[PDB]
Amino acid sequence: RFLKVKNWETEVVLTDTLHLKSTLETGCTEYICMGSIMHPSATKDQLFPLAKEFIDQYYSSIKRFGSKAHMERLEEVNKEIDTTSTYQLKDTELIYGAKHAWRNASRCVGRIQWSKLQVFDARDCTTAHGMFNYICNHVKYATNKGNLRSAITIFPQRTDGKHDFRVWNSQLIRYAGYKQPDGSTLGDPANVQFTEICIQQGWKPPRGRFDVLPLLLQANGNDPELFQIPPELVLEVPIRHPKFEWFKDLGLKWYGLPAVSNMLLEIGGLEFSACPFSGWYMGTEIGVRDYCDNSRYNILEEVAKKMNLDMRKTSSLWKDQALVEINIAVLYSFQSDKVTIVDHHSATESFIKHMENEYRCRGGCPADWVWIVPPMSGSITPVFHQEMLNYRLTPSFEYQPDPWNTHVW
Amino acid sequence: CPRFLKVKNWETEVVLTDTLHLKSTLETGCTEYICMGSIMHPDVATKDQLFPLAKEFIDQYYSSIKRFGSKAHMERLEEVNKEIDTTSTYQLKDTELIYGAKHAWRNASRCVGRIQWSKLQVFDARDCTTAHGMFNYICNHVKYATNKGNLRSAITIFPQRTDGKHDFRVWNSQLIRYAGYKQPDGSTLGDPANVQFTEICIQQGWKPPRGRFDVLPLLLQANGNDPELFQIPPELVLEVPIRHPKFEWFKDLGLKWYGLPAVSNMLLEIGGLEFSACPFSGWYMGTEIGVRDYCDNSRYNILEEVAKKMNLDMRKTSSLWKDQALVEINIAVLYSFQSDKVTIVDHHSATESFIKHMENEYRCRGGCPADWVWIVPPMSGSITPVFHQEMLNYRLTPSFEYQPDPWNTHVWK
Ligand code: HEM
Ligand code: HEM
Ligand SMILES: CNCc1cccc(-c2cc(F)cc(CCc3cc(C)cc(N)n3)c2)c1
Ligand SMILES: CNCc1cccc(-c2cc(F)cc(CCc3cc(C)cc(N)n3)c2)c1
Ligand SMILES: C[C@H](O)[C@H](O)[C@H]1CNc2nc(N)[nH]c(=O)c2N1
Ligand SMILES: C[C@H](O)[C@H](O)[C@H]1CNc2nc(N)[nH]c(=O)c2N1
Ligand SMILES: [Zn+2]
């Protein structure tokens, strides 16, 4: 059936037909909704239907459905799955599939940009040194001296599961975190375990508060190897405040490039277990989550101190006051250093415009309200009031197990 | 469905295990292929439909009092069954009415305030016959719940539906709301959300004072008759002028709000019976007023004027002038209620209490249905503990349900 979504602020109603194409499960049933669950729970036989469906939508996207080129490709893919148990995507199909995995990512508020994505084909890579080279080229290209450009680098697909290419880092650029003897934590507390794995593999930690972690890269199922990204490639922004001159004395900085490297890219039934992709930051990712999550840098206390706020009762809203000032400083700093960043008001505005575009030309837009609404000031952004339907379209980005739980050394 | 479902808290690593979802009754709106978890809204019962719905509720009640299978349990089952047989409906005992109402709150997946669910004063108004009598019952509710600012949660329950043509209804969506007036030039005075209901009241005879904060009259329908207008005595309507602990100019905005949030358009379902007029009230979380009532673009929409008096740069969104003013507005609301000793709860305290409640319910009851989209506050979401808490949403009965607005369905006499 046709489903309607209403915006309760503007009363705009949209009609979704695109959900009729979905396949993968959401995790919900008619009796239980799992919309706030973060992770809800091949062979020649399963592979050809998936390949067929993807080729079908590719040749439908370039308006040659049923053409001779379409027919030949379908035959070509069938023979190749027969004789090799897999198949290789054409360049054009790889690019189309990577763009549509982004387009279909229901949890991404930045998808108005989906068709502007630089795709780096790294399927000829065979070693961790080669992965390192490809990743350095990605970082330099995407950083572009602060004028960030979206990019993805795609390493060889999975074959038997025993020869997986993996980036062990969850993101290409992250700060280390160290367990202190006295119990507390220096650096980024989320990364304490991964930092420990790097140390155990030979990394010499500077034991500072903003130590860029090395890359830990696994090619063809072999043991992973360490590499230091050249520092001139890692763009950083010292965080200061436009009115509070003491804010710079907090000593805070962050990196310019957000680059997810632990997800799996699925295209036509093929699985690309190493596909680092990067864009640019929304300010709240750093200012709310990275800095103010209790289990992260957790700086609200210190900032509220320097603002001299009354911190004895929660109803003074001292946490909310310090949170806003921190996020002002983040946006001010990136902007002053001409490093691409988007605030949550502008980003959610763009996303509403994007939904409008997608309903018009595509018949829908899968969207996960739980992830789309920003982690602060929710209802004064327009996505808060926008009903969204969430469903799974392929090509897709998926979660996968952490490599240190599966790898045999 | 599987027997055990797990939810994780991503901040604390606590894992909880839910088995109560096996008792879920109606539908969520979601399917295997689509999730409707952010959709706001995704004739009578026959003798055959009513029998099992009543047995399920009676079984649950007698289980709750540790008398499942007792002689009083089997006798009550037989009495209910005979009564459905001869009359096509049945009447709840007072004990069962109170149990049912408290559990409809306990089961209300969108309510963050449920740690209080067992402390609800239930007013049995099933003997009411006229709109004047409904007015009396509602006035007593308001006075009891307000308690001079020491608010007490309460529900008043009017006669259940019979054939669907004799419904009791409070036409107001909430017992206390401010009027809104559309101007010829397109501007609105008062609360823009209430223009439609205000016009109905005016048509029915209400003489509107045409101010910014005019308490609307009650519009009360008894036994399916045409609704009738009544003015709530103003001394029963407790109000708080909003001032700011630092900004002396904030009082010059002339803002105020009423102390008592009382939802009156929902339907209470107990054992298959339908209570179409069941006004219930608690106390406010500050953000309901400071974020939604005052700062929604389609409501009072004061962010601009507050930002002006704060002398913020309003030319770029990246200055976060909106966020800065939103916090100060919510500081003022909490400060003004606390100063006047009117019960209110901030979003930090309320979500912390909800986590403790949910954990206790998981341990004692086997689960706690919760709608994350509604539980997470409309500001500063991720610095409250519920943001990081995975939730399962499902529908347990007794329950509160939405129902059609009565002006869309009423057959005028
Ligand atoms: C161009 C600017 C972009 C912006 C402003 C943006 C914004 C965001 C934000 C704020 C999130 C939530 C992240 C979190 O809370 O962890 C997100 C998630 C996500 N983004 Fe985008 N993004 C951008 C580019 C991209 C690109 C280039 C891709 C892939 C090609 C992508 C795919 C995704 C996916 C798959 C998620 C879900 C991640 C997860 O489930 O952990 N995004 N995005
Ligand atoms: C005692 C203090 C209470 C607090 C602090 C509280 C808090 C809240 C809040 C913040 C909401 C969201 C409201 C909105 O965004 O419109 C809500 C919704 C709700 N509450 Fe509670 N509540 C309380 C008492 C009650 C009581 C006494 C009942 C019923 C007996 C109740 C049943 C509900 C229901 C059914 C909803 C869903 C409303 C809807 O869908 O429109 N609550 N509550
Ligand atoms: C489910 N959260 C997992 C988690 C926990 C802690 C940190 C992170 C995380 C760390 C990073 F360095 C970077 C990110 C990128 C998120 C992201 C990705 C893209 C393409 C654009 C954007 N604008 N943003 C996410 C992710
Ligand atoms: C989907 N929102 C519908 C909507 C829209 C605009 C206003 C309202 C609304 C108006 C009011 F006077 C009062 C409320 C109270 C909601 C509520 C109820 C209770 C028992 C405790 C509490 N703390 N809060 C809600 C509701
Ligand atoms: C579209 C979305 O479902 C809608 O805006 C919801 C979001 N969450 C909410 N949460 C609460 N408490 N109250 C609301 O009115 C809403 N509105
Ligand atoms: C439990 C809940 O699903 C979890 O905390 C989610 C909520 N929404 C989110 N939204 C974004 N953008 N990022 C997140 O990490 C989360 N975490
Ligand atoms: Zn769902």
Choosing among A7, A9, A33, A365, which should be mutated to test the B contact, i.e. which has the most B CBs within 10 A?
A33
To the nearest 10°, report the CA torsion of A89, A90, A93, A94. Answer: 70
A216, A340, B170, B175 from A142: Cα distances, Å: 20, 11, 60, 57
Domains of chain A: 16-123+150-160+264-278+348-372 (3.90.340.10), 124-149+164-235+399-403 (3.90.440.10), 236-258+281-346 (3.90.1230.10)
Please report the beta strands in B143-185, taking only residues with DSSP state E, as ranges in sequence order. 154-157, 169-170, 180-182
Closest CA to A332 of A245, A242, A248, A257: A242
Closest CA to A399 of A38, A122, A64, A54: A38
Does the distance separating the beta carbons of B326 and A390 come in below 8 Å? Answer: no
Q: How far apart are the C-alpha atoms of B117 and B135, rounded to whole Å?
A: 26
B257 is annotated as an active-site residue = no
Tokens of B140: 């007593």
Q: How far apart are the C-alpha atoms of A166 and A223, rounded to whole Å?
A: 10
Q: How far apart are the C-alpha atoms of B301 and B191, rounded to whole Å?
A: 10
Q: What is the 3-state secondary structure (H, E, C) of A104-124?
A: CCCCCCCHHHCCCCEEEECCC
Q: Which residues pair with A236 in a beta bridge?
A: A255
Q: How far apart are the C-alpha atoms of B390 and B9, rounded to whole Å?
A: 6
CB atoms near residue B408 (< 10 Å): 6
| C-beta of residue B155 within 8 angstroms of C-beta of residue B247 | no
Q: How far apart are the C-alpha atoms of A339 and B102, rounded to whole Å?
A: 55
Q: What is the 3-state secondary structure (H, E, C) of B14-59?
A: CEEEECHHHHCCCCCCCCCCCECCCCCCCCCCCHHHHHHHHHHHHH
Q: How far apart are the C-alpha atoms of B309 and B250, rounded to whole Å?
A: 8
| C-beta of residue A371 within 8 angstroms of C-beta of residue A347 | no
| C-beta of residue A271 within 8 angstroms of C-beta of residue A396 | no
Tokens of B70: 């007792």
Q: How far is A42 from chain B (nearest CA, A)?
A: 22
B166, B221, B406 from B226: Cα distances, Å: 10, 6, 10
Residue carrying the six token digits 């008096």: B309
Residues 337-396 of A with CB under 8 A from B: 343, 345-346, 369-370, 373-380, 384, 387-392
Interface size A-B, in CB pairs within 8 Å, comes to 205
Q: Which residues pair with B247 in a beta bridge?
A: none
Ligand 7 is an ion; residues with CB less than 5 A from it: A 28, 33, 35; B 30, 35, 37
Q: How far apart are the C-alpha atoms of B233 and B43, rounded to whole Å?
A: 36
The H-or-E segment that residue B202 falls in is: helix B195-203
Q: How far apart are the C-alpha atoms of A107 and B38, rounded to whole Å?
A: 13
Q: How far apart are the C-alpha atoms of B182 and A8, rounded to whole Å?
A: 19
**Structural biology method used:** X-ray
Is residue A139 annotated as involved in ligand binding? no
The H-or-E segment that residue B268 falls in is: strand B267-270
In degrees and rounded to multiples of 5, residue A189 shows phi and psi of -65, -25
The H-or-E segment that residue A336 falls in is: helix A318-336
A203 is annotated as an active-site residue = no
**Torsion-angle region of residue B348: left (phi > 0), alpha (psi -120 to 50) or beta?**
alpha
Amino acid in position A387:
E
What helix, strand, coil percent values describe chain B, rounded to 5? Answer: 40, 15, 45
Closest CA to A391 of A50, A18, A115, A117: A18
Cα B278 to chain centroid distance, Å, stands at 10
Closest CA to A283 of A243, A355, A333, A354: A333
Closest CA to A325 of A380, A235, A256, A250: A250
CB atoms near residue A330 (< 10 Å): 29
Burial B332-365 (b: 16+ CB within 10 A, else e): bbbbbbbeeebbbbbbbbbbbbbbebbeebbeee
In degrees and rounded to multiples of 5, residue A2 shows phi and psi of -85, 130
Q: How far apart are the C-alpha atoms of A103 and B316, rounded to whole Å?
A: 28
**Torsion-angle region of residue A270: left (phi > 0), alpha (psi -120 to 50) or beta?**
beta
